[model samples]
Target: QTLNVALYEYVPDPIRFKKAVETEWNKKEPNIKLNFVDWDCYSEDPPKDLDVFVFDAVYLSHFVKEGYLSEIPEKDIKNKEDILPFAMEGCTIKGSAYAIPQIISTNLLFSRKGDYDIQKVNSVYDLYDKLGKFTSEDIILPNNKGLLIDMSGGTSKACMYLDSLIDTTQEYTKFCSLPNLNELNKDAIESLVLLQSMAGKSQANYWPENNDSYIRAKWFINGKGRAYIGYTEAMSQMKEFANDIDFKTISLSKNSNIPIFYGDVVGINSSITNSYKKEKAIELANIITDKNTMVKAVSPDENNKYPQYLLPARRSVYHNLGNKYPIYGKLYKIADNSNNKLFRTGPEIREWLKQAKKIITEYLQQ
Candidate 1:
């Protein structure tokens, strides 16, 4: 039996993830084969003939609303209580679970240790002011400077605008509900101005408009920029160069003081009608999301010398892994602290994303 699986493409290490899944899966069910599928993050259409797939938690509402996801029986989720509360919350809609939480990410400001007092960074504008005054000397680079961020896709750009809106209004509700199109347009323009200040001639004039998170993280670690802005998982790509510099990370909430996180979830195709296939698919999802599997996927091994710094979705994974990797402790604190005030939206975000993309692209390109 062949089970087609479509995992997230932007993982810290795709090969390691594949190996980790296959090793654990083959050991459990030797007869069934797992066929990996190429993933397209921006595609509005889901892949055809796939039993299970991993997707951004932001898309959870859209998938569930459109019947693209199958509801997993509570009994099928092994050790469901072990999953992080916010991570699970992101996967559920209207009090019903639609997917299994896999990994989570949030925006963070990364800089050299003691480079700047992070406490003073009360807002995105404040961050802009401080970073703007710095010269290349501050970042230890010969030329070029300031924050390095990924502004590649419409979704990413739209979120950047949303970040500015939340920061300016200090209202998490506005973001969750999303302002009207006119307001969004105003905010989008303002966001573009702010981005230009950070990325245009004023700051990082040498900034390359690259969308790949790994490239941005690699550049930051190599002293190409003073500070980097990205999700928690980008730390994995920076691992190899991590030992070269002393760095620290802080949750970047702009001014709202509310933490926002994006998560990945595994869902089974609702169209699968065969009972045996569905059962096997459930086991596959469970196996991939198991705490032990998560540890194996992110931890360093003989083949991959650098460890992946992706955050875990399980409390036990954090507690167990923290004993060895000190970063896990910090990550757990970030996750623990955001348990109450997490900024999230419903399926309506799908429509916002589509429209916001158009606005973001039009402004960004101009």
Candidate 2:
């Protein structure tokens, strides 16, 4: 029987991804046939007869209420305790989790190991002081336009995260919710000022057009910068300069006390009608989220090299992969241990991004 799967591809390797399920299902009875569906399958209704669908963690709750996904029976989640609490927190709704933790994503700070010190910088004020000590030759900040926008309260995730920090209402939150996201509030102006001052000193342009990865990779490898904050994905592309820097991730916020994580998750169709197929879907779901399967999906294999960097939600997945990167184990622990300060809802972040674009116009391109 074919299990119509609506799993969307996050990376270029589908064969490697499906291979785990293929190998597992082959060993079991009732070998399930598989049919893959595109990401757009998530937009309207669950595709007819689709047994399982992958879901971004943020999107799972909305669809669950919309009757699109089913909670795995408690009996089915064999590795529930082994899964990191933070990794599964976003997928858990009303006590029962709809999405199963599979892949995870988050940002990291990369720097020339000996020169840059994360211990000395604990707050935004600490970071500001450190930035003041260096010119572009000594350090680099990402040339991202949206970072300033987000920092200035242009989006809910950033705004909400900021709100948690100051324990006060942000004007940026008001600006974030409205049609007119562009306006110079005291806070936004302050954020832009800090950003400008940091960028102004840096030898690097810190402007997108001028600071592409090739240029940044060269700057990093040449030991031009003391440090830079980068997402895991961005760091992977700098394979040309591999081994030149140190990798560590802290909370996106200045307060390591509060942290935010971003990642994808897995969910099965709540409306899956066929009973036998439903059980098989549960089997496939269990297989997909299992530690070995999740880790294997991202590891190097015969099909391709420089394998996809899908961070696993299960910490044991790292162990199963033999603790390949000791640094990543720290990252996984940080993710599992950090407080949840970011909104995990899809539309929650979407509204912020929309307002962010408008507010960004007011701050950038000036």
Candidate 3:
């Protein structure tokens, strides 16, 4: 029997991780064949022939709402308790399990150890005020056009971040409905105003362009910036400097006591053929998600190189990998215990992203 798996390829690690899993699967089940396809072009045009598709939470929610996914039987998988509650919640839709947890990527704030006092800045506004001290002669803020504060990305990450800022924890259904045209307008104005102000005085740039999260780590090591927002993976990248430095990491909501949203999620396609195939596909998923499997999947490579920003989904995986992998141990502790929540609900994320983009774009232009 063969299982056709369609998954996304965002970073090189996913490709490496998938290949590793495929190798393991081939070793365990020599007779069974697994075909892996990267859905890179699917962003423009989705595939027509796919037995099993793995997606992030936002896309899963959109697909589920459009009636494009199939439901997984709950009784099939063993050791459900081994999965984290938030991780499982991301794959569930309307009381039905639609996917398994693959990875959890949560956002975090990274700063140069002891470069700038952390206690002085606690809230978002505090961040701005601190940045103000580095204006003109001391630092040069990047002057990039077409850049906004980016409180909302194309997916629900932004909405989740905003929700965390507000200290509200509701299911996606409820949270998505909270932001309308007016509310989004207000949010956009507020976020962009802050962005513009920071742009005017600070040397920091919005990540992924001028300085990616990886480069930001280097800059932090060199005491270039006060602090920056990024994924847990950054911690691993900054370990070299951390030997002597005392950098502090915090979640966006740490000062506010809110549940910030961060992390990647997994979901299954509802389009597989036949009950037998579906059952086998589910079985394959279960195997991939087992605590042992997850630990191996998320464990650092032989060089003991850590991705600092990537966070594992399962609690057991986090704990086990932490103890065994010292390089990523402290990072896992911070990410797993951070106030950030995963944006698991699909439909609400889609709605919120659309509204947020519209509002954010207008505010930035204004």
Quantify all predictions' global Cα lDDT against the true fold.
Answer: 0.69, 0.55, 0.53
Those runs of model 1 whose alpha carbons end farther than 4 Å from true positions after fitting are 133-144, 167-179, 185-192, 201-212, 240-254, 340-354, 364-366
TM-score of each: 0.85, 0.72, 0.77
* List of clashing residue pairs for candidate 2: 136-202, 136-203, 138-226
List runs of model 2 lying over 4 Å from the truth: 11-15, 40-50, 123-125, 132-226, 238-243, 251-257, 303-309, 338-343, 346-356, 364-366
Q: Which stretches in model 3 have alpha-carbon errors above 4 Å? A: 40-48, 133-178, 182-192, 199-213, 242-255, 302-304, 307-309, 327-340, 344-355
Better of 2 and 3 by lDDT: 2
| Candidate 1 worst ten-residue window by lDDT | 135-144
* Cα RMSD, each candidate: 3.8, 6.0, 4.9
Tens-place lDDT digits, model 3, residues 1-366: 777766545532565467556766677677788888776422532354555655666456566676666676678655777666676766676798767766666445455455465435554455665565333422323322111122324333355335443542223332434455465444323544554455432233234555343565555555554455555555566655655443233323323434333434344456666777677677667666666655655556675565333566666766776665564566555545544455543355555566666665455445
**How would you encode candidate 2's per-residue C-alpha lDDT over 139-255 as one tens digit per residue?**
343432111111222343344333333322222121223323444344434443454345443332343454343355444555544455544544444554555556654433334
| Highest TM-score model number | 1
